[PDB]
Amino acid sequence: MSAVRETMDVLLEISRLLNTGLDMETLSICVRLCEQGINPEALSSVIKELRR
Template sequence: MPSEAETRQDKQASAAQARQVIDIFHEISTLLNADLDRQTLSICISLIENGVNPEALASVVRELKRDAEEVRKELQS
């Protein structure tokens, strides 16, 4: 049975690896001008890992961005 210190180290290593993955996806998102922050990317990745269709998720994200832009324009008017 692993010691408490080993378990803690494993959790820290997993957290560091997860941050690295999010950082890589954020870089890709930035290069593609997707305008997604790290938190949004993390949520999207979790949804996909839990079975959400990536294409459907992309459509929803695009639609939400369009709606948000419309609201911004209305508020500025």
């Protein structure tokens, strides 16, 4: 839980650096999906269409 916070912080900072346009809630969701073994390629594809 402590560890998980710190992990979300790294992830948010990496996101900012890579200037992607993801915030905390969308990113948490993205992480939960990826961790379930989701194809990131397909997922990126959905996300770009959703931002349009």
